[PDB]
Amino acid sequence: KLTIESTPFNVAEGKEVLLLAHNLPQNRIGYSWYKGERVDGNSLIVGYVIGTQQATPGPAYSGRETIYPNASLLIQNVTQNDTGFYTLQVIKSDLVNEEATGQFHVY
Ligand SMILES: [Zn+2]
Numbered sequence: 001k002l003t004i005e006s007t008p009f010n011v012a013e014g015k016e017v018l019l020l021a022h023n024l025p026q027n028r029i030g031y032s033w034y035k036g037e038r039v040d041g042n043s044l045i046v047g048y049v050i051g052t053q054q055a056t057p058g059p060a061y062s063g064r065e066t067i068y069p070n071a072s073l074l075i076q077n078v079t080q081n082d083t084g085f086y087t088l089q090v091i092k093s094d095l096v097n098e099e100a101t102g103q104f105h106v107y
Contacts, residue, residue, distance in 0.1 A: 004088060006104040011078050017104050021071040021088055025098060030091045031071045035060040037085045037101050045073070045086075078106050 005020040019033075029050050035043040045060040048067045055067055066074040071090065075082060086102040 002088070002090060002098045002100040004086070004100045004102045006086075006102075009104055011104055011106050013078060013080060013106055015078060016074060016076045017078060017082075019073040019075070019086055019088070019102070019104070021090075021100070024071055025090060025092055027093045028090050029093050031067060032089045032091070033065070033067060033073045034087045034089070035084070036087060038087055039089050039099055080106050082106050 001023060002025070003022045005022060007018050007020060011017045031048045032039070033045040034040055035045055043060045044058065045065050046067050047056045048054070050069065053069065064076045068074070071088060073086065073088070083106045084103070087099060088102065089097055089099045091097050
């Protein structure tokens with residue numbers, strides 16, 4: 001099963017956290033990262049198409065997020081408001097998509 005690991009879980013203010021994705025499905029074609037506990041287009045941080053490597057941001061995009069081809073999400077220069085949940089959806093070529101959440105704490 002798809003799972004999210006935040007590293008580090010505890011992040012000092014001003015530093016960076018990397019959200020790792022374990023057990024990606026093989027016939028995947030893209031990723032979407034959301035702020036919060038659910039897939040919700042209004043909290044889309046960033047969408048990513050594997051085939052073309054095109055990263056489409058926003059509305060939850062600040063300046064600070066980077067999505068990698070292996071689906072990990074780097075958030076830099078973290079603030080006190082970033083404390084919370086983050087949800088990844090992996091879109092598959094057959095659209096039987098998978099999701100996971102997703103947590104870290106800023107001190
Ligand atoms: Zn605290």
